Structure formats: structure tokens, C-alpha cells
Amino acid sequence: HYIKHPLQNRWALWFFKNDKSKTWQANLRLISKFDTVEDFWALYNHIQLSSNLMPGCDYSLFKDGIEPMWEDEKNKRGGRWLITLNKQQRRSDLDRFWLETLLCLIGESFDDYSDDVCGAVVNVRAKGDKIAIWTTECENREAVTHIGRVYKERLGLPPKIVIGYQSHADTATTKNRFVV
């Protein structure tokens, strides 16, 4: 209890402020970095909930040294598992899904495919909120599909409900490379 509990990885929380007068990259803001469980909660418990963000804003949680953008060396050959949520329940459920996603990352829930995880992003959007897990290599089928399945399970989505993975290259130029 008196000693801090180390995480496997150091993580960085980023915030994207919707400001149309600036370039996309200039609207990114590094909030803080942490590498223990206690320091995660100290950060999480004292920042604004996703459900209280303005539309067009994002939070991103990425491994230290990976910027939360397509162009990063660790993202550019990769892709995302994308979850698009109904608007009605944002007040009720966005925060829960985002926290569950954060806990998957920091707890290293993806087993032997932890190295493939880059981070996660929540987009607060008028057309529907999105949460996604970003991975490093779209060609790594085993890793991508394991991460997908574990993530789907941790969100509680049933067997019927299929989610899709798309490469960042395809998004930035959309079909699913993989589904689980």
C-alpha cells in the first residue's frame, strides 16, 4: 500500500481541442504521463469526463513516445478497432466505455499481444461518439484479431455484434481488414 504499483508501460494522456482556426496537429495537447496505478487514478479522478467534453474534442492514451496520430512511425503501418456509439446514452455510457478501454490498456489485458497496442482514442462527435484501440501493424493478423476479441469481450458486446478493424492509411485516403 505505501509503495506505488508499477505499470508495464509509461502512458501519456493527450487532449484534442476543437479549434478550426488551427491545423489538426497544433490542436493536440500532452496533458500528462504516468507509470503507476496510483498516478493513473490521480490523473483520471481530476480531469473532465469524456461526456462533458465539447463535440469535436478527443482524449487519447498512448504509450510514451508514440504521438496519437497516423503519422507516427508506430501508427503509420497500423490501424484501429473502431466502436461507434449511439448519441442517446453519452451521459449514461460513454465514460464507462472509455474507462473500460483505459483499464484494458494500462492493465495489459491483451496478453502476449501487448507490444502491438499503441493506444486508444475517444472522439466526442455530434454524429456519434467513437472509441478505438490503435495497433501498430495491420499485417499482424494474430495480434490484431486477438486484441479485437479481448476488447469486444471487455466492452460486453455479444457474439452477434461484429466490430471492424481498418488501416489508418485507408482511413486517411472505408472497408474492414478484419472483423471479430
Binding site: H5, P6, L7, Q8, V37, E38, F40, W41, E100, L103, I106, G107, E108, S109, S114, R154
Partner: peptide, 12 residues
């Protein structure tokens, strides 16, 4: 290597 379950993370 360093893994935590959801319940171990939440009890903090």
C-alpha cells in the same frame, strides 16, 4: 510482465 485485472485496477 506487469498485468492487472480490472478488479485489481479499480480497487485503488
Amino acid at each position: 510482465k506487469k498485468r492487472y485485472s480490472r478488479x485489481q485496477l479499480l480497487x485503488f
